[PDB]
Amino acid sequence: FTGLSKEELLKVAGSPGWVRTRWALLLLFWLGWLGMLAGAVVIIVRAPRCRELPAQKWWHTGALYRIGDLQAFQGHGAGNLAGLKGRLDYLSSLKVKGLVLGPIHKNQKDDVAQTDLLQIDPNFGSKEDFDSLLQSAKKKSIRVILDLTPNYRGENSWFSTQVDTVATKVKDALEFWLQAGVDGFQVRDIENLKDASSFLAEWQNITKGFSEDRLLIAGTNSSDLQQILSLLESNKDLLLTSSYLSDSGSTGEHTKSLVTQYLNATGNRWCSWSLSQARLLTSFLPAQLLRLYQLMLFTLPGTPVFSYGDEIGLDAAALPGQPMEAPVMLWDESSFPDIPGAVSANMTVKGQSEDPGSLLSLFRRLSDQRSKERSLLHGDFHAFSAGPGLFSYIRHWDQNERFLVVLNFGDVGLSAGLQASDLPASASLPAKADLLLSTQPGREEGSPLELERLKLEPHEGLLLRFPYAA
Amino acid sequence: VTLQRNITLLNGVAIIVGTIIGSGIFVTPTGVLKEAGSPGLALVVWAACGVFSIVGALCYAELGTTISKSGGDYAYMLEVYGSLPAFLKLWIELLIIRPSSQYIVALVFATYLLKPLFPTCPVPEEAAKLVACLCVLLLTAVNCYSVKAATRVQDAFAAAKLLALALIILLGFVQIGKGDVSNLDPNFSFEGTKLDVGNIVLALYSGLFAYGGWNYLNFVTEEMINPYRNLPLAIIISLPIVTLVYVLTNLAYFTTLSTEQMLSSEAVAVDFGNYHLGVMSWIIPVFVGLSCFGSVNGSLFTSSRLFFVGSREGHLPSILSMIHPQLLTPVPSLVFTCVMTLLYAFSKDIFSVINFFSFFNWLCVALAIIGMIWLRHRKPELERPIKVNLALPVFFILACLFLIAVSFWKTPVECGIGFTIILSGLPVYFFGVWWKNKPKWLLQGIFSTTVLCQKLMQVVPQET
Ligand SMILES: *[C@@H]1O[C@H](CO)[C@@H](O[C@@H]2O[C@H](CO)[C@@H](O)[C@H](O)[C@H]2NC(C)=O)[C@H](O)[C@H]1NC(C)=O
Ligand SMILES: *[C@@H]1O[C@H](CO)[C@@H](O[C@@H]2O[C@H](CO)[C@@H](O)[C@H](O)[C@H]2NC(C)=O)[C@H](O)[C@H]1NC(C)=O
Ligand SMILES: *[C@@H]1O[C@H](CO)[C@@H](O[C@@H]2O[C@H](CO)[C@@H](O)[C@H](O)[C@H]2NC(C)=O)[C@H](O)[C@H]1NC(C)=O
Ligand SMILES: *[C@@H]1O[C@H](CO)[C@@H](O[C@@H]2O[C@H](CO)[C@@H](O)[C@H](O)[C@H]2NC(C)=O)[C@H](O)[C@H]1NC(C)=O
Ligand SMILES: N[C@@H](Cc1ccc(O)cc1)C(=O)O
């Protein structure tokens, strides 16, 4: 009811000069469409490409959990092999991708003739129970690594006898246990095994001969870099857990030098980060540094290996009358029958599980972040200089959220002075960054924080993040 | 000169199927499993959502057969509640809802089409925007050219998306029939009744996004051949097929990927294709993009018709609802819809207006069904070839009221902002529609603009 009708429009809209404009506008529209398509094509072509994935294995994704003494993990009571089915749920909580069970084979004494790595010791259980445990763990997406150290009851890892017999016996054991369905092996105290390099290479070859998702782990006690490197001269894909890192490197500069030297010497290859082969973190660190080292080990380029109870900080100096190698796990206040009441409420797993400022919550957050972020999964690592006593580095893979870790190992407060001036332009740190967490409560989370006036409290760590910006 | 009746039963079925099956089935299952925990709970949520959608579709089928005029869900309110609520709904529909939805679907199409080129690094936005704009322009040009071509395109793309879903079903069946699964008989493991209903309803909420669009056929009524018989038959054919296909697709998803893999995924279909194909795994994302393409068409068409009706009642300028004498298509309405859709390419927070308006659909549906019941009570003289038994609409109304209460519960602040935006539509109504005795210097300007647009587009007013 507003405008011309059919007849008037026919009269006034058919003249030349009004039909030319319609065709002209149609051609302009089609030319604009073609130009937009050409622009989109040239933008797509002139763009950086993605970077191919490095084909991560199952043990490249998260941390490893070690259960040295199986009897003491379930507290006072039966140490039957099936009891782990009640605790396995917890492993998933911690989001650990592995589980190194202790030696469960027959072992009388240093007599090699009566010790066989084929039969499970009757105290722990039976073969059917082990198969049930393996199947349940596989259904839970948690892998199992079996320790095959012959003489674990004795002081010496081996029987001090002639090597070849023990080597043949263990190499026979690997085949049977692989047919059983285990996902990896571990051998400890190889410094007591003469010519261990050839045996380790042959065992790695026979383990890889079954599948490419089979792991072999070796353990030493030597902190010498050259001795560690000599073991890996003939082996490229062997995880060697050693006490190299834990050599009283409390100060930040020494720790940074150790990490950088090891990474440079190994050729930036995949490694395992731990403080020892069978010892807890507290055996080498004071109680004031446990959070710092847990923040460190969950961000370094490798597989972090933690012993059982390291998520809540067990120690053998708080409960007397205990072995130095097999502390009892503190599940509840009834964990320790002796001295009935010495166990407090903050030293137990259930007490820390509800406290948002305990070691357990920090461990859970770090394990969740490590096994989910691609930069922490397989990102490049670059450490840069800072103040006198600070360890500062950055993780960046291709284009994902870059991570920046700053640790203050000094006993007094100090600034940052984050003067890099040498990092590649692909990962240059910006003026502002977020804050995932801090070791010491008192800092708001998520809020962007300027990295120019960074003040660090004594023994504090920061896990800032920032996006990729070319 | 009118709009010809050239939509058959197959075309209506294709429209409904293409609109419902978009990108929800490839993304939502992650959220459903996140808020449900156990696979069996997710399956029962999807089944319940399907039943709820079937109920609503039957109600709307009866309502649209009772009132056989286009611009559904808006013409019903115009006839029952009057002119002011109808304009209040139409203003919001043409201002925020439709352009944002179309642009979001176009962006999803653009991003998923280019995914094989950049499998890991994110697709650049400066090319996704251009691809989305090209798709919108091409589809609006196709719609402007003819109506039969649009129906053919919709049929082809509905067939394509059905074929993709069938491929997923066959892959899942091949996986499950070759041996162990260990993901179906312990289905109630980790059966999370977290906060009891306090979370369960939220799970249902997520499923609803996958079951949206069953009411878009009512937008294009009085353009179908024999609507009285075809309108309910198309819905009856479409809805159970969609429900069964969705359930089977979820089962196939669960037969391959673990729970932790699913909650850590951003696109379940992409991971499914990567696992089951390895090589030629780009097939799964490409089809997804194609699906979105069809959805865009299924939107634009309907949207145009809505605005067409919006101009016949005087709520919109008379330039709309004008037909090309030869092509017999509403060119100005389609042009306006395309311009409004493209105008949202400059918004950097497009994914927020959906959160702003999440209660608006349920409120409109509840109001329409309440008007259905009131019209049945007060005017028992109309022709009702289909008559759903009572106590069904009242339960659907109760469900819609609970749904809008949940929507307010989830996020109150932008719900209030949406209330304010809706209330902002009163001055425009009182200036444009209510004010008749306009100053003489405005009527001449509007007339000149309309005449210029007519001469540019060669469109004549509709005559009956
Ligand atoms: C281990 O398997 C490889 C491949 O068949 C062979 O030796 C490898 O390659 C060279 C040549 O002998 C050796 O120096 C490496 O130590 C072997 N790499 C491995 C462990 O795969 C040989 O058949 C097997 N035995 C040896 C020598 O390790
Ligand atoms: C590993 O630690 C043990 C002590 O736990 C030490 O082993 C000594 O090795 C030297 C020869 O290398 C010998 O004196 C004995 O074999 C060990 N001495 C002892 C235990 O009295 C040593 O600390 C480490 N082994 C090394 C690298 O020598
Ligand atoms: C140790 O790693 C460095 C890393 O490049 C290798 O080259 C050194 O690079 C640093 C930093 O630019 C400079 O001091 C010299 O260019 C090199 N000095 C060193 C540390 O040697 C180096 O070749 C690697 N191995 C050695 C020989 O230490
Ligand atoms: C467990 O937490 C309590 C609560 O703060 C703390 O108890 C302290 O014990 C230490 C000795 O290690 C002493 O400083 C005081 O007896 C307590 N100080 C307080 C009340 O903070 C301590 O953090 C933990 N208890 C221990 C380790 O004994
Ligand atoms: N069904 C659409 C989602 C949708 C939601 C609301 C609609 O109005 C239309 C569609 C999809 O699965 O992608």
Side-chain angles (χ1 to χ4, degrees), chain A residues 2-4 6 9 18 22 33 36-37 40 49-50 53, chain B residues 117 120-121 130 133-134 325 447 450 454-456 459 461:
Chain A
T2 303
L4 301 173
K6 182 175 173 65
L9 185 68
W18 261 123
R22 295 198 272 265
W33 201 83
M36 272 175 67
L37 179 83
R49 305 231 61 81
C50 295
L53 278 298
Chain B
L117 284 186
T120 73
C121 51
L130 264 65
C133 294
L134 289 180
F447 183 83
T450 308
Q454 284 202 25
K455 273 185 286 187
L456 270 177
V459 293

PDB file of all heavy atoms in Angstrom, chain A residues 2-4 6 9 18 22 33 36-37 40 49-50 53, chain B residues 117 120-121 130 133-134 325 447 450 454-456 459 461:
ATOM      1  N   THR A   2       2.111   1.120  -0.439  1.00  0.00           N
ATOM      2  CA  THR A   2       3.027   2.256  -0.516  1.00  0.00           C
ATOM      3  C   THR A   2       3.979   1.995  -1.681  1.00  0.00           C
ATOM      4  O   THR A   2       4.950   1.247  -1.534  1.00  0.00           O
ATOM      5  CB  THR A   2       3.784   2.451   0.790  1.00  0.00           C
ATOM      6  OG1 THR A   2       2.851   2.616   1.866  1.00  0.00           O
ATOM      7  CG2 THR A   2       4.675   3.682   0.711  1.00  0.00           C
ATOM      8  N   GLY A   3       3.693   2.607  -2.823  1.00  0.00           N
ATOM      9  CA  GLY A   3       4.503   2.463  -4.011  1.00  0.00           C
ATOM     10  C   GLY A   3       3.653   2.244  -5.242  1.00  0.00           C
ATOM     11  O   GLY A   3       2.424   2.249  -5.198  1.00  0.00           O
ATOM     12  N   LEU A   4       4.339   2.045  -6.363  1.00  0.00           N
ATOM     13  CA  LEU A   4       3.664   1.853  -7.636  1.00  0.00           C
ATOM     14  C   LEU A   4       3.073   0.449  -7.729  1.00  0.00           C
ATOM     15  O   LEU A   4       3.432  -0.462  -6.978  1.00  0.00           O
ATOM     16  CB  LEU A   4       4.632   2.087  -8.794  1.00  0.00           C
ATOM     17  CG  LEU A   4       5.289   3.465  -8.864  1.00  0.00           C
ATOM     18  CD1 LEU A   4       6.349   3.492  -9.951  1.00  0.00           C
ATOM     19  CD2 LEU A   4       4.247   4.543  -9.101  1.00  0.00           C
ATOM     20  N   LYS A   6       1.702  -2.742 -10.654  1.00  0.00           N
ATOM     21  CA  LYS A   6       2.335  -3.486 -11.739  1.00  0.00           C
ATOM     22  C   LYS A   6       2.393  -2.668 -13.026  1.00  0.00           C
ATOM     23  O   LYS A   6       3.424  -2.626 -13.706  1.00  0.00           O
ATOM     24  CB  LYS A   6       1.590  -4.802 -11.967  1.00  0.00           C
ATOM     25  CG  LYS A   6       2.192  -5.674 -13.053  1.00  0.00           C
ATOM     26  CD  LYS A   6       1.487  -7.016 -13.137  1.00  0.00           C
ATOM     27  CE  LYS A   6       1.977  -7.821 -14.327  1.00  0.00           C
ATOM     28  NZ  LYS A   6       3.410  -8.198 -14.188  1.00  0.00           N
ATOM     29  N   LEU A   9       4.761   0.473 -12.803  1.00  0.00           N
ATOM     30  CA  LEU A   9       6.141   0.003 -12.773  1.00  0.00           C
ATOM     31  C   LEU A   9       6.576  -0.498 -14.143  1.00  0.00           C
ATOM     32  O   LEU A   9       7.704  -0.240 -14.579  1.00  0.00           O
ATOM     33  CB  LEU A   9       6.307  -1.096 -11.725  1.00  0.00           C
ATOM     34  CG  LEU A   9       7.750  -1.569 -11.545  1.00  0.00           C
ATOM     35  CD1 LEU A   9       8.595  -0.469 -10.922  1.00  0.00           C
ATOM     36  CD2 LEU A   9       7.807  -2.832 -10.712  1.00  0.00           C
ATOM     37  N   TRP A  18      17.296   2.161 -17.400  1.00  0.00           N
ATOM     38  CA  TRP A  18      16.914   1.453 -16.190  1.00  0.00           C
ATOM     39  C   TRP A  18      17.104  -0.050 -16.303  1.00  0.00           C
ATOM     40  O   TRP A  18      17.132  -0.731 -15.272  1.00  0.00           O
ATOM     41  CB  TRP A  18      15.450   1.749 -15.827  1.00  0.00           C
ATOM     42  CG  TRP A  18      15.287   2.798 -14.768  1.00  0.00           C
ATOM     43  CD1 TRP A  18      14.584   3.960 -14.871  1.00  0.00           C
ATOM     44  CD2 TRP A  18      15.824   2.771 -13.440  1.00  0.00           C
ATOM     45  NE1 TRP A  18      14.656   4.664 -13.693  1.00  0.00           N
ATOM     46  CE2 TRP A  18      15.412   3.954 -12.799  1.00  0.00           C
ATOM     47  CE3 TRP A  18      16.617   1.862 -12.732  1.00  0.00           C
ATOM     48  CZ2 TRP A  18      15.765   4.253 -11.486  1.00  0.00           C
ATOM     49  CZ3 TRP A  18      16.966   2.162 -11.430  1.00  0.00           C
ATOM     50  CH2 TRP A  18      16.541   3.347 -10.820  1.00  0.00           C
ATOM     51  N   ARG A  22      20.562  -2.636 -14.079  1.00  0.00           N
ATOM     52  CA  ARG A  22      20.380  -3.938 -13.448  1.00  0.00           C
ATOM     53  C   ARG A  22      21.465  -4.921 -13.879  1.00  0.00           C
ATOM     54  O   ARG A  22      22.065  -5.604 -13.040  1.00  0.00           O
ATOM     55  CB  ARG A  22      18.989  -4.481 -13.774  1.00  0.00           C
ATOM     56  CG  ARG A  22      17.861  -3.651 -13.182  1.00  0.00           C
ATOM     57  CD  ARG A  22      16.552  -4.417 -13.150  1.00  0.00           C
ATOM     58  NE  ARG A  22      15.807  -4.267 -14.394  1.00  0.00           N
ATOM     59  CZ  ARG A  22      14.852  -3.370 -14.591  1.00  0.00           C
ATOM     60  NH1 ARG A  22      14.500  -2.518 -13.642  1.00  0.00           N
ATOM     61  NH2 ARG A  22      14.236  -3.325 -15.768  1.00  0.00           N
ATOM     62  N   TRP A  33      32.120 -11.015  -5.989  1.00  0.00           N
ATOM     63  CA  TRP A  33      32.194 -12.382  -5.481  1.00  0.00           C
ATOM     64  C   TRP A  33      33.487 -13.063  -5.915  1.00  0.00           C
ATOM     65  O   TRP A  33      34.157 -13.722  -5.107  1.00  0.00           O
ATOM     66  CB  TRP A  33      30.980 -13.177  -5.959  1.00  0.00           C
ATOM     67  CG  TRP A  33      30.677 -14.387  -5.138  1.00  0.00           C
ATOM     68  CD1 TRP A  33      29.973 -14.430  -3.972  1.00  0.00           C
ATOM     69  CD2 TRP A  33      31.061 -15.736  -5.423  1.00  0.00           C
ATOM     70  NE1 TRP A  33      29.898 -15.720  -3.510  1.00  0.00           N
ATOM     71  CE2 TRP A  33      30.559 -16.542  -4.385  1.00  0.00           C
ATOM     72  CE3 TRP A  33      31.784 -16.340  -6.455  1.00  0.00           C
ATOM     73  CZ2 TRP A  33      30.756 -17.919  -4.348  1.00  0.00           C
ATOM     74  CZ3 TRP A  33      31.979 -17.707  -6.417  1.00  0.00           C
ATOM     75  CH2 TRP A  33      31.465 -18.481  -5.371  1.00  0.00           C
ATOM     76  N   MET A  36      36.391 -11.601  -3.935  1.00  0.00           N
ATOM     77  CA  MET A  36      36.409 -12.128  -2.575  1.00  0.00           C
ATOM     78  C   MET A  36      36.951 -13.550  -2.542  1.00  0.00           C
ATOM     79  O   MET A  36      37.725 -13.909  -1.646  1.00  0.00           O
ATOM     80  CB  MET A  36      35.004 -12.074  -1.980  1.00  0.00           C
ATOM     81  CG  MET A  36      34.675 -10.768  -1.282  1.00  0.00           C
ATOM     82  SD  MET A  36      32.962 -10.710  -0.731  1.00  0.00           S
ATOM     83  CE  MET A  36      32.989 -11.967   0.540  1.00  0.00           C
ATOM     84  N   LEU A  37      36.554 -14.378  -3.513  1.00  0.00           N
ATOM     85  CA  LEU A  37      37.083 -15.737  -3.579  1.00  0.00           C
ATOM     86  C   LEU A  37      38.590 -15.731  -3.806  1.00  0.00           C
ATOM     87  O   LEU A  37      39.326 -16.502  -3.175  1.00  0.00           O
ATOM     88  CB  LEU A  37      36.377 -16.525  -4.682  1.00  0.00           C
ATOM     89  CG  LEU A  37      36.844 -17.968  -4.879  1.00  0.00           C
ATOM     90  CD1 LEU A  37      36.161 -18.892  -3.886  1.00  0.00           C
ATOM     91  CD2 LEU A  37      36.585 -18.427  -6.303  1.00  0.00           C
ATOM     92  N   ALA A  40      40.310 -14.749  -0.551  1.00  0.00           N
ATOM     93  CA  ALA A  40      40.326 -15.866   0.388  1.00  0.00           C
ATOM     94  C   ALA A  40      41.372 -16.900  -0.008  1.00  0.00           C
ATOM     95  O   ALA A  40      42.101 -17.419   0.847  1.00  0.00           O
ATOM     96  CB  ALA A  40      38.941 -16.506   0.472  1.00  0.00           C
ATOM     97  N   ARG A  49      51.992 -23.067   7.808  1.00  0.00           N
ATOM     98  CA  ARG A  49      51.435 -24.405   7.909  1.00  0.00           C
ATOM     99  C   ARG A  49      51.549 -24.931   9.337  1.00  0.00           C
ATOM    100  O   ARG A  49      52.312 -24.422  10.160  1.00  0.00           O
ATOM    101  CB  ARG A  49      52.143 -25.349   6.938  1.00  0.00           C
ATOM    102  CG  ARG A  49      52.138 -24.874   5.496  1.00  0.00           C
ATOM    103  CD  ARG A  49      51.640 -25.959   4.558  1.00  0.00           C
ATOM    104  NE  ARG A  49      50.277 -26.368   4.870  1.00  0.00           N
ATOM    105  CZ  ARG A  49      49.191 -25.708   4.490  1.00  0.00           C
ATOM    106  NH1 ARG A  49      49.271 -24.598   3.776  1.00  0.00           N
ATOM    107  NH2 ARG A  49      47.994 -26.174   4.837  1.00  0.00           N
ATOM    108  N   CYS A  50      50.769 -25.970   9.627  1.00  0.00           N
ATOM    109  CA  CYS A  50      50.883 -26.651  10.906  1.00  0.00           C
ATOM    110  C   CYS A  50      52.202 -27.420  10.980  1.00  0.00           C
ATOM    111  O   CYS A  50      52.893 -27.628   9.979  1.00  0.00           O
ATOM    112  CB  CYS A  50      49.712 -27.609  11.118  1.00  0.00           C
ATOM    113  SG  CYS A  50      48.061 -26.873  11.281  1.00  0.00           S
ATOM    114  N   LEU A  53      52.967 -33.782  14.259  1.00  0.00           N
ATOM    115  CA  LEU A  53      53.092 -34.304  15.608  1.00  0.00           C
ATOM    116  C   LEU A  53      54.287 -35.254  15.702  1.00  0.00           C
ATOM    117  O   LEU A  53      54.666 -35.885  14.711  1.00  0.00           O
ATOM    118  CB  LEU A  53      51.814 -35.033  16.020  1.00  0.00           C
ATOM    119  CG  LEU A  53      50.634 -34.208  16.545  1.00  0.00           C
ATOM    120  CD1 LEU A  53      51.013 -33.470  17.817  1.00  0.00           C
ATOM    121  CD2 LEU A  53      50.101 -33.243  15.503  1.00  0.00           C
TER     122      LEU A  53
ATOM    123  N   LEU B 117      43.208 -28.677   5.758  1.00  0.00           N
ATOM    124  CA  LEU B 117      44.396 -27.921   5.378  1.00  0.00           C
ATOM    125  C   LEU B 117      45.242 -27.562   6.595  1.00  0.00           C
ATOM    126  O   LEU B 117      46.474 -27.518   6.509  1.00  0.00           O
ATOM    127  CB  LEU B 117      43.994 -26.663   4.610  1.00  0.00           C
ATOM    128  CG  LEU B 117      43.563 -26.880   3.158  1.00  0.00           C
ATOM    129  CD1 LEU B 117      43.325 -25.550   2.467  1.00  0.00           C
ATOM    130  CD2 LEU B 117      44.597 -27.700   2.408  1.00  0.00           C
ATOM    131  N   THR B 120      46.028 -29.128  12.829  1.00  0.00           N
ATOM    132  CA  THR B 120      46.359 -28.826  14.219  1.00  0.00           C
ATOM    133  C   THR B 120      46.347 -27.327  14.502  1.00  0.00           C
ATOM    134  O   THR B 120      45.646 -26.872  15.409  1.00  0.00           O
ATOM    135  CB  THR B 120      47.724 -29.426  14.578  1.00  0.00           C
ATOM    136  OG1 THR B 120      48.762 -28.666  13.951  1.00  0.00           O
ATOM    137  CG2 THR B 120      47.806 -30.865  14.101  1.00  0.00           C
ATOM    138  N   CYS B 121      47.117 -26.552  13.745  1.00  0.00           N
ATOM    139  CA  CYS B 121      47.117 -25.112  13.943  1.00  0.00           C
ATOM    140  C   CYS B 121      45.758 -24.536  13.547  1.00  0.00           C
ATOM    141  O   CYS B 121      45.167 -24.966  12.553  1.00  0.00           O
ATOM    142  CB  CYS B 121      48.240 -24.448  13.141  1.00  0.00           C
ATOM    143  SG  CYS B 121      48.355 -24.867  11.377  1.00  0.00           S
ATOM    144  N   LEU B 130      35.706 -14.720   5.092  1.00  0.00           N
ATOM    145  CA  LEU B 130      35.464 -14.595   3.659  1.00  0.00           C
ATOM    146  C   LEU B 130      34.706 -15.797   3.114  1.00  0.00           C
ATOM    147  O   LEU B 130      33.796 -15.640   2.292  1.00  0.00           O
ATOM    148  CB  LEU B 130      36.786 -14.409   2.916  1.00  0.00           C
ATOM    149  CG  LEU B 130      37.183 -12.968   2.595  1.00  0.00           C
ATOM    150  CD1 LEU B 130      37.438 -12.175   3.864  1.00  0.00           C
ATOM    151  CD2 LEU B 130      38.409 -12.945   1.699  1.00  0.00           C
ATOM    152  N   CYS B 133      31.065 -15.493   4.193  1.00  0.00           N
ATOM    153  CA  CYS B 133      30.365 -14.478   3.411  1.00  0.00           C
ATOM    154  C   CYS B 133      30.081 -14.969   1.997  1.00  0.00           C
ATOM    155  O   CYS B 133      29.000 -14.717   1.450  1.00  0.00           O
ATOM    156  CB  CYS B 133      31.181 -13.187   3.382  1.00  0.00           C
ATOM    157  SG  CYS B 133      31.346 -12.373   4.988  1.00  0.00           S
ATOM    158  N   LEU B 134      31.042 -15.667   1.386  1.00  0.00           N
ATOM    159  CA  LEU B 134      30.821 -16.226   0.056  1.00  0.00           C
ATOM    160  C   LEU B 134      29.676 -17.228   0.064  1.00  0.00           C
ATOM    161  O   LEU B 134      28.836 -17.228  -0.844  1.00  0.00           O
ATOM    162  CB  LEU B 134      32.097 -16.889  -0.458  1.00  0.00           C
ATOM    163  CG  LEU B 134      33.260 -15.978  -0.837  1.00  0.00           C
ATOM    164  CD1 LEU B 134      34.426 -16.811  -1.332  1.00  0.00           C
ATOM    165  CD2 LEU B 134      32.827 -14.976  -1.888  1.00  0.00           C
ATOM    166  N   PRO B 325       7.633 -10.134 -10.789  1.00  0.00           N
ATOM    167  CA  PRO B 325       6.562 -10.700 -11.626  1.00  0.00           C
ATOM    168  C   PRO B 325       6.968 -11.949 -12.389  1.00  0.00           C
ATOM    169  O   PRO B 325       6.118 -12.815 -12.632  1.00  0.00           O
ATOM    170  CB  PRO B 325       6.213  -9.545 -12.575  1.00  0.00           C
ATOM    171  CG  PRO B 325       7.413  -8.657 -12.561  1.00  0.00           C
ATOM    172  CD  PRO B 325       7.976  -8.759 -11.181  1.00  0.00           C
ATOM    173  N   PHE B 447       8.040   7.067   0.334  1.00  0.00           N
ATOM    174  CA  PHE B 447       7.495   6.708  -0.971  1.00  0.00           C
ATOM    175  C   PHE B 447       8.571   6.742  -2.049  1.00  0.00           C
ATOM    176  O   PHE B 447       8.637   5.846  -2.897  1.00  0.00           O
ATOM    177  CB  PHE B 447       6.344   7.648  -1.329  1.00  0.00           C
ATOM    178  CG  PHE B 447       5.666   7.313  -2.624  1.00  0.00           C
ATOM    179  CD1 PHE B 447       4.680   6.343  -2.675  1.00  0.00           C
ATOM    180  CD2 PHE B 447       6.009   7.974  -3.793  1.00  0.00           C
ATOM    181  CE1 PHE B 447       4.054   6.035  -3.866  1.00  0.00           C
ATOM    182  CE2 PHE B 447       5.387   7.669  -4.986  1.00  0.00           C
ATOM    183  CZ  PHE B 447       4.408   6.699  -5.023  1.00  0.00           C
ATOM    184  N   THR B 450      10.862   3.730  -1.611  1.00  0.00           N
ATOM    185  CA  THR B 450      10.207   2.505  -2.054  1.00  0.00           C
ATOM    186  C   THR B 450      10.131   2.437  -3.574  1.00  0.00           C
ATOM    187  O   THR B 450      10.342   1.373  -4.164  1.00  0.00           O
ATOM    188  CB  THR B 450       8.810   2.403  -1.444  1.00  0.00           C
ATOM    189  OG1 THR B 450       8.893   2.586  -0.025  1.00  0.00           O
ATOM    190  CG2 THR B 450       8.205   1.041  -1.734  1.00  0.00           C
ATOM    191  N   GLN B 454      11.818  -0.349  -5.942  1.00  0.00           N
ATOM    192  CA  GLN B 454      11.017  -1.087  -6.912  1.00  0.00           C
ATOM    193  C   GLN B 454      11.648  -1.031  -8.295  1.00  0.00           C
ATOM    194  O   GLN B 454      11.745  -2.048  -8.990  1.00  0.00           O
ATOM    195  CB  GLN B 454       9.598  -0.521  -6.965  1.00  0.00           C
ATOM    196  CG  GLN B 454       8.702  -0.904  -5.810  1.00  0.00           C
ATOM    197  CD  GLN B 454       7.238  -0.782  -6.171  1.00  0.00           C
ATOM    198  OE1 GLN B 454       6.869  -0.857  -7.341  1.00  0.00           O
ATOM    199  NE2 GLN B 454       6.396  -0.574  -5.169  1.00  0.00           N
ATOM    200  N   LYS B 455      12.079   0.159  -8.714  1.00  0.00           N
ATOM    201  CA  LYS B 455      12.674   0.298 -10.039  1.00  0.00           C
ATOM    202  C   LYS B 455      14.004  -0.439 -10.129  1.00  0.00           C
ATOM    203  O   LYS B 455      14.342  -0.994 -11.180  1.00  0.00           O
ATOM    204  CB  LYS B 455      12.845   1.777 -10.385  1.00  0.00           C
ATOM    205  CG  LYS B 455      11.617   2.396 -11.032  1.00  0.00           C
ATOM    206  CD  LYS B 455      11.878   3.825 -11.474  1.00  0.00           C
ATOM    207  CE  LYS B 455      11.937   4.767 -10.286  1.00  0.00           C
ATOM    208  NZ  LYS B 455      12.021   6.191 -10.711  1.00  0.00           N
ATOM    209  N   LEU B 456      14.776  -0.451  -9.040  1.00  0.00           N
ATOM    210  CA  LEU B 456      16.040  -1.178  -9.042  1.00  0.00           C
ATOM    211  C   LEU B 456      15.823  -2.686  -9.114  1.00  0.00           C
ATOM    212  O   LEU B 456      16.536  -3.384  -9.843  1.00  0.00           O
ATOM    213  CB  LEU B 456      16.860  -0.818  -7.804  1.00  0.00           C
ATOM    214  CG  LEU B 456      17.811   0.371  -7.945  1.00  0.00           C
ATOM    215  CD1 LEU B 456      18.505   0.661  -6.625  1.00  0.00           C
ATOM    216  CD2 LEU B 456      18.827   0.109  -9.041  1.00  0.00           C
ATOM    217  N   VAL B 459      10.068  -5.182  -8.754  1.00  0.00           N
ATOM    218  CA  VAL B 459       9.173  -5.957  -7.905  1.00  0.00           C
ATOM    219  C   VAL B 459       7.837  -5.237  -7.804  1.00  0.00           C
ATOM    220  O   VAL B 459       7.775  -4.006  -7.730  1.00  0.00           O
ATOM    221  CB  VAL B 459       9.777  -6.198  -6.504  1.00  0.00           C
ATOM    222  CG1 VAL B 459      10.995  -7.099  -6.600  1.00  0.00           C
ATOM    223  CG2 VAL B 459      10.147  -4.880  -5.847  1.00  0.00           C
ATOM    224  N   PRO B 461       3.765  -5.158  -5.948  1.00  0.00           N
ATOM    225  CA  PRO B 461       3.065  -5.584  -4.734  1.00  0.00           C
ATOM    226  C   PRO B 461       2.230  -6.830  -4.976  1.00  0.00           C
ATOM    227  O   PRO B 461       1.761  -7.090  -6.085  1.00  0.00           O
ATOM    228  CB  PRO B 461       2.177  -4.381  -4.391  1.00  0.00           C
ATOM    229  CG  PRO B 461       2.767  -3.233  -5.141  1.00  0.00           C
ATOM    230  CD  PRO B 461       3.341  -3.820  -6.388  1.00  0.00           C
TER     231      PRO B 461
END
